């Protein structure tokens, strides 16, 4: 029953807009609009390839907040390297198990200095060779 | 290199400041200072202490801007949900395949009402069994 699909849809639509790193209100709600109408006007196809703006990888609208969320992992990754670097300085030769990590994570970061990320890895083993200093 | 250590942090601050995820909290801009204040000083071991509200999962910070990523998503798989089933209302009928797929993805979901994401799994299927009907 076509009538039972748009009570679906306006709910989603309902916590659609309540997501704000899904849009602006500005395309958002005119394709949830457009949808609405073209569901209540019985063509489903069209409505299908309506939402569909809302959902692709391809769209305009999914870059923006997967940037968003790209820049916010790449920063928390920096700060990580800085923060494992001062507490490496407030120990005050060491191991060279320590100082071959730090020497990746810089070699691996002039290699990806476009996308940080790659180099998560190389971040994790120096701050686990920070660790275990502390340690002993 | 603790003189280096306040450059880098200073770069990345800046950079923390345009993440508007990681930048939208009252409170970051008195960490960012009070940990650059630190590291002038060449109290690195609290320099590090502060850090932590940045890079920390239980930090309120980092609560904040995952939950946002998570809504994004859980409306997302929402809205293909939707779609998979005007698709599949689209097309005027059901083989045994689609329906199991339909009838999961809304157990599911009811189920999993805090966490739709942990049906994504029963999404595919359900998007994966309007794929097949389409082509045949």
Do not use: Y
Not at 106 to 134: G, I
């Amino acid at each position: 029953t076509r009538a039972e699909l748009i009570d679906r849809f306006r709910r989603v639509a309902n916590e659609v807009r309540k997501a704000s790193l899904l849009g602006s209100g500005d395309d958002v709600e005119s394709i949830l609009a457009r949808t609405q109408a073209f569901l209540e006007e019985g063509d489903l196809d069209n409505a299908a390839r309506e939402m569909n703006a809302l959902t692709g990888w391809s769209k305009t609208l999914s870059r923006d907040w997967l940037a968003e969320v790209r820049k916010v992992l790449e920063v928390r990754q920096a700060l990580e390297v800085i923060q494992a670097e001062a507490r490496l300085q407030s120990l005050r030769p060491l191991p060279e198990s320590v100082e071959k990590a730090r020497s990746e994570v810089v070699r691996c970061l002039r290699e990806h200095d476009r996308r940080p990320l790659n180099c998560w890895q190389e971040v994790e083993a120096f701050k686990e060779e920070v660790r275990k200093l502390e340690k002993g």
